[PDB]
Design a protein around this ligand. Structure first.
Ligand code: ZN
Ligand code: ZN
Lengths: 151, 579, 527
């Protein structure tokens, strides 16, 4: 009734079996305690993933094929207070949910990055213009000459 | 197997290639500007000089693996039969005195113990083809009643050929301990004339299986089955296709499969849903025909290649097709997991990338069929339910491995190498789990030979170029598993061990010769040997030479790295996997 | 056939000629030639019979007889083997080799392939040889010693057909000794294209469809799509691809000629329609015939644009056939021109029959009578010029079947004096067709006699009507003649018998219909 989620750093995390079947990759691994490697995820990120699965033991999520029930689903209050973390560790939680095939954590953890791409100031969309190249310098000069009249 | 193809491609073509109005090998910096030593005059847009400390040949080498897998491990290892017709013997005085021994060698109670073994263990295989086997005990009784007769009808000889195909399936999947309790070996050695110390585990069970398959085909020839098309031909071939018969005789199995397509399409029943204006016998007949159809589509896709041009599978499981999603999920679950495999393995010889929407759809159907195989009944008083579970679970693990292999090759997405390693360990943990008693014969199904061939060939290929630790431990584990596969595969198992050994010696060659940088491409003897293996086996699969030999007395008239390539090809030849 | 009181209108005739377009298919294409009703519980099966039979029929033919057969094929049958094997002077060496290793015991697959090819050629020689040349070479007496039949019958009353069928069975048995399914090679396709110039596809129609399926499997195994010679190829390979081109066109011809419900895997559908250089002409005429006779089974009537385009192409290929030179000395060229002119007359007759049926165009019945007289004047000419083996080609059985069946069907309903004289000429010609067709000629005479006796029933019974449809017993008998043969071409009952314990269980109008069907049953054109 317990499985073990071995992290990439080597720590063993004994999780209850029904709670840990939120992961589609582990619930399919159980067709063979029962240990399993999670090779890229650190111990802290896997601990966050396991705590997320501990809260959503009884939760009800969309059917992973929904048009609007998946896109327009708001984040939980626990999911928003839960992901007030470092940015790279947020992306590593998203990578952990992508490896472990946890679609609702790859949903609620990934609407936060979507809320951070929008909702940002136009001043630092103007600043981050060609931090990745994406334009020739002739086209960059033509763009900066096109909207020079404003400022 | 060589281009530059570095990480962090540029968006626009560079300023130098627009100054010169040529094509742009759109890398950072370029393959076309690095060729001329203009490295520093192309980097200067932002950040600059970035660190390209990776191994750049790897993406266009994995795109080469997508072709090498198809031409070696699919076609050249299993589906290529090199035959010279001037040296091959041809007489029907041979099989009338050979197969007569194998038909007089099987006794009555031995055959009923074979049928009991099939009824108790192999229910996941014949029930697609023939249905329930308690109907077939009467046909074994009728075979032993009609054994001493002289005038046999065609209708009787079809049941004889069908039950001899069933006996072939029994002999192939029987463990050596249960086989020694039924059969004695010494009159068989007195007939064949070989070494006396050659017990069933040493390679005689495969000989008896191949000769029982040849006796089933001999009784089909006594039917004159081409003049009399009948569904029992299709059933007998679907029983024989559960063994290594389509890999022992890969050109005889294609002609028999073409005759099974001709026999099936002769009935002209495309919709297998029973209509409302049907005889209640006709309804059950169309249900049985619909089961035989999807079993035949599975065995029809599993023999696809250049030596099988007439296909049957004409329906798609994602997104002019005819015959899909009208049928109830009882044995199309074996086809729906192979039609999901055809969608992946159609891009092997094809020179285009699969779209990622297709791969995501295939991943969703993988999750659905995972839950559907978890939604099966568990008959603990039946041994064939666990074998059906193992078949439908090993197929979804195989298609999962191939899906994340194509994610690794074509797009290099999130942890897709770790997903390849994960599903390779799942395939191992499904085969090693059958090394316990009462299920040791589960590892004899030909899908495990195909799957272990693909997986150990990709891991041996990837160990050459990428030095890792998880991949190396996985390769050690698959080498142990390939050493521990059942010996009834025989020559194909020895050729797979030879191919793994050849890729390991090619790894040893990779760590010796220094890689020749050439700006836009690389050069190494390993690359040229891998290029040449495909050319050799495509030359062996070109029937123009047999055509020229057929049309009459026409006779066909046709640096430093070259020595290394020729010495490796003379030492480790790729033609040693054809026989 | 039709779409209470009585009437005498002509509403039934446009709905009845469209019914002829279905009846012609389901009787004269499928149920007369391509339907072999079989019973697997009654049919014997052993290799203790066909081995000794093939031993006798190969030990019967001697060395001096075989080269006389090959010389007959070289002198007289040049229009047939050239699409399959090309030159037969190359095959004298293989006949020499077959008589070299005849006494050996360890044969190869390649050698038995050449043996099967030359025994198919020997079957073609026996089938097309006149009785005056065939009685000189062979002797009738050991065949009645072996078969047990009475010695009073000569070659002319159905004995040459027995030797032809048994030599075809010897070619197939040597293919079985090749284990040809394990070794796909072009000698299978060539031997089958030689055997398909005889009545082998109509004596064993379900075996010939399986052999044709194996020939499609063998041909497409080579994966040669284009047959034009490339400049970079070996000049052996270019001649080889030209050889596969002239084999592919003959194979698509036989692929079309065996089209039916019992032949589901096709090759002629992969050749685009038109909508040496005398071998491509035969495929052009056969593809035009394929464009015509596709409208038999389907109900969608052709446009006038399609029939007019077929008419212009018909005039073009008529000029190409009339532009073929011929030598009265070279019998090969005479038989070549007979094949080309008979095929183009058959396509012309079918085109103007479709003009008469689908549109009732004026001066179309005169064209049908004219091209039927052209077909007669092609066949009756061969009896006067000592070339009576020209009338053994399998196209003159199919064409005369379609012609005498349509003229009988038209003489039932539409009275005319020219059609009646044409029907008398067709009846005399069907009586004068060669005896090498055997049972199919007797069944065509039976079908013509049945459609002649049905004219008497159309005469003696008055047509009725219900205001919208025209009831007549002749119409119901013609409905049931298609219903019975579509029941015979239904493989559901053979499927039920093959699955095992599943067993199948099943006014004066109706009296006249049942008495005619009890007197003239449509299941007597079957075997
Ligand atoms: Zn560039
Ligand atoms: Zn550049």
């Amino acid at each position: 009734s317990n499985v073990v989620l071995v992290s990439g750093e080597g720590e063993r995390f004994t999780v209850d079996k029904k709670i840990a079947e939120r992961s589609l990759l582990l619930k399919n691994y159980l067709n063979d305690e029962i240990v399993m490697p999670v090779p890229n995820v650190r111990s802290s990120v896997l601990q966050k993933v396991i705590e997320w699965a501990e809260h959503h033991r009884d939760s009800n999520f969309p059917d992973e094929d929904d048009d609007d029930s998946r896109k327009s689903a708001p984040v939980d209050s626990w999911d928003r207070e839960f992901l007030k973390v470092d940015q790279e560790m947020l992306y590593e939680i998203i990578l952990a949910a992508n490896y472990l095939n946890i679609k609702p954590l790859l949903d609620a953890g990934c609407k936060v990055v979507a809320e951070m791409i929008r909702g940002r100031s136009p001043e630092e969309i103007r600043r981050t213009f060609n931090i990745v190249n994406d334009f020739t310098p002739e086209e960059e000069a033509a763009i900066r000459r096109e909207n020079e009249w404003a400022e | 197997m060589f281009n530059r193809t570095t990480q962090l491609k540029s968006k626009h073509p560079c300023s130098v290639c627009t100054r010169r109005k040529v094509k742009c090998d759109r890398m950072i910096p370029c393959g076309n500007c690095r060729k001329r030593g203009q490295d520093s005059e192309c980097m200067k847009s932002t950040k600059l000089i970035t660190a390209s400390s990776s191994k750049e040949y790897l993406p266009d080498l994995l795109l080469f693996w997508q072709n090498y897998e198809y031409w070696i491990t699919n076609i050249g290892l299993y589906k290529t039969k090199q035959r010279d017709l001037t040296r091959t013997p041809a007489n029907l005085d041979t099989d009338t005195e050979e197969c007569m021994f194998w038909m007089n060698y099987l006794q009555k109670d031995q055959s009923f113990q074979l049928m009991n073994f099939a009824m108790e263990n192999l229910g996941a295989l014949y029930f697609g083809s023939i249905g329930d086997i308690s109907e077939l005990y009467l046909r074994v009784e009728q075979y032993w009643d009609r054994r001493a007769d002289k005038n046999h009808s065609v209708d009787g000889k079809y049941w004889d050929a069908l039950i001899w195909s069933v006996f072939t399936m029994c002999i192939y999947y029987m463990p050596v301990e249960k086989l020694a309790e039924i059969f004695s070996v010494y009159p068989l050695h007195e007939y064949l004339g070989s070494n006396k110390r050659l017990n069933w585990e040493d390679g005689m069970q495969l000989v008896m299986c191949q000769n029982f398959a040849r006796c089933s085909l001999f009784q089909l020839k006594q039917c004159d089955f081409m003049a009399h098309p009948d569904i029992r031909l299709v059933q007998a071939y679907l029983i024989l296709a559960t063994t290594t018969f389509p890999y022992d005789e890969p050109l005889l199995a294609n002609s028999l499969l073409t005759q099974c397509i001709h026999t099936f399409k002769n009935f002209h029943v495309d919709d297998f849903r029973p209509l409302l204006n049907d005889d209640p016998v006709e309804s059950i007949a169309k249900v049985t025909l619909g089961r035989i159809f999807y079993r035949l589509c599975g065995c029809d896709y599993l023999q696809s290649g250049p030596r099988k041009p007439i296909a049957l599978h004409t329906e798609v499981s994602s997104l002019n097709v005819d015959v899909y999603r009208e049928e109830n999920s009882t044995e199309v679950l074996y086809w729906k997991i192979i039609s999901l495999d055809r969608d992946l393995d159609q891009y092997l010889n094809k020179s285009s990338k699969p779209p990622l929407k297709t791969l995501d759809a295939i991943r969703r159907e993988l999750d659905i069929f995972q839950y559907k195989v978890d939604s099966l009944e568990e008959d603990f008083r039946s041994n064939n339910s666990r074998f059906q579970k193992f078949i439908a679970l090993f197929q979804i693990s195989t298609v999962s491995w191939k899906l994340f292999k194509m994610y690794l090759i074509y797009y290099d997405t999130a942890d897709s190498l770790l997903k390849v390693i994960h599903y390779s360990k799942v395939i191992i943990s499904l085969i090693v789990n059958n090394f316990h008693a009462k299920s040791e014969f589960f590892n004899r199904h030909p899908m495990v030979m195909q799957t272990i061939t693909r997986v150990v060939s990709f891991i041996s290929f990837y160990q050459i170029f990428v030095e890792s630790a998880a991949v190396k431990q996985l390769l050690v584990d698959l080498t142990e598993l390939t050493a521990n596969l059942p010996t009834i595969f025989g020559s194909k198992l020895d050729k797979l061990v030879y191919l793994t050994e050849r890729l390991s010696k090619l790894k040893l060659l990779w760590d010796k010769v220094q890689l020749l940088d050439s700006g836009d491409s690389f050069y190494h003897p390993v690359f040229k040997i891998l290029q040449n293996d495909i050319k050799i086996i495509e030359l062996k699969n070109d029937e123009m030479f047999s055509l020229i030999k057929g049309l009459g007395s026409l006779v066909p008239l046709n640096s430093d790295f070259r020595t290394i390539v020729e010495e490796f090809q003379s030492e480790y030849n790729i033609s040693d996997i054809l026989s």
